[PDB]
Amino acid sequence: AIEFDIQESKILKGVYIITPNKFRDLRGEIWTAFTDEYLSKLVPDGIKFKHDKFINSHFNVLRGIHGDVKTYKLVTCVYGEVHQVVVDCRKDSPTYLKWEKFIISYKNQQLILLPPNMGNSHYVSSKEAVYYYKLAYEGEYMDAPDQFTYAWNDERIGIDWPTNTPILSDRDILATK
Amino acid sequence: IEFDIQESKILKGVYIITPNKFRDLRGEIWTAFTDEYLSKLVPDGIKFKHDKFINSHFNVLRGIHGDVKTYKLVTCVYGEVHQVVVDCRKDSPTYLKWEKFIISYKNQQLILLPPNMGNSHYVSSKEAVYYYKLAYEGEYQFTYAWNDERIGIDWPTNTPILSDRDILATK
Given an 8 Å threshold on Cβ–Cβ distance, is B60 in contact with A27? Answer: yes
Is residue A124 within 8 A of residue A152, CB to CB? The reply is no
Whether A22 contacts chain B with CB within 8 A: no
Is residue B104 within 8 A of residue B127, CB to CB? The reply is no
Residues of A belonging to the active site = 66, 133
* CA neighbor of B24 nearest in space, from A116, A77, A52, A55: A55
Q: Is the bond preceding residue B64 a cis peptide, omega within 30 degrees?
A: yes
Q: Side-chain half-sphere of A163: how many Cα atoms within 13 Å?
A: 14
Amino acid at A9: S
- The C-alpha angle A109, A112, A113, rounded to 5 degrees, equals 145
Comparing alpha-carbon positions, the chain B residue that sits nearest to A107 is: B55
Q: Convert chain A into a string of H (helix), E (strand) and C (coil).
A: CCCEEEEECCCCCCCEEEEECEEEECCEEEEEEEEHHHHHHHCCCCCCEEEEEEEEEECCEEEEEEECCCCEEEEEEEECEEEEEEEECCCCCCCCCCEEEEEEECCECCEEEECCCEEEEEEECCCEEEEEEEEECCCCCCCHHHCEECCCCCCCCCCCCCCCCCECCHHHHHCCC
Q: A156: how many CB neighbours lie within 10 A of its CB?
A: 9
| B133 contacts: CB under 8 Å, gap ≥ 6 | A52, B33, B48, B50, B51, B52, B72, B73
Nearest-CA distance B92 → chain A (Å):
31
Is residue A153 within 8 A of residue A159, CB to CB? The reply is yes
- The C-alpha angle B9, B14, B20, rounded to 5 degrees, equals 90
| Whole-number Å distance between alpha carbons of B109 and A5 | 32
Q: Which of B1, B26, B140 is the best substitution to test chain A (most A C-beta atoms within 10 A)?
A: B26
Given an 8 Å threshold on Cβ–Cβ distance, is B57 in contact with A28? Answer: yes
Residue B158: exposure state from Cβ atoms within 10 A (0-12, 13-18, ≥19): exposed
In the set B105, B132, B136, B144, the catalytic residue is B132
DSSP character at residue B38: H
| Whole-number Å distance between alpha carbons of B45 and B128 | 32
Amino acid at B165: R
| Whole-number Å distance between alpha carbons of B70 and B22 | 31
Phi first, then psi: give them for residue B95, nearest 5 degrees.
-50, 125
Q: Considering just the CA atoms, what is the radius of gyration of chain A in Å?
A: 16
Q: What range defines the domain where residue A138 resides?
A: 1-177
Given an 8 Å threshold on Cβ–Cβ distance, is A52 in contact with B36? Answer: no
* CA neighbor of B59 nearest in space, from B13, B139, B121: B121
Residues of B in contact with A106 (CB under 8 A): 55, 129
Whether A173 contacts chain B with CB within 8 A: no
Q: Is the bond preceding residue A65 a cis peptide, omega within 30 degrees?
A: yes
Residues of B in contact with A22 (CB under 8 A): none
Given an 8 Å threshold on Cβ–Cβ distance, is A52 in contact with B29? Answer: no
Given an 8 Å threshold on Cβ–Cβ distance, is B30 in contact with A53? Answer: yes
| Whole-number Å distance between alpha carbons of B79 and B42 | 28
| Whole-number Å distance between alpha carbons of A109 and A112 | 10
| Whole-number Å distance between alpha carbons of A8 and A12 | 8
Whether A108 contacts chain B with CB within 8 A: no
Nearest-CA distance B94 → chain A (Å):
31
Determined by X-ray
- When divided into structural domains, chain B yields a total of 1
Q: Which of A27, A75, A169 is the best substitution to test chain B (most B C-beta atoms within 10 A)?
A: A27
Whether B57 contacts chain A with CB within 8 A: yes
Active site residue B95: no
Nearest-CA distance A13 → chain B (Å):
26
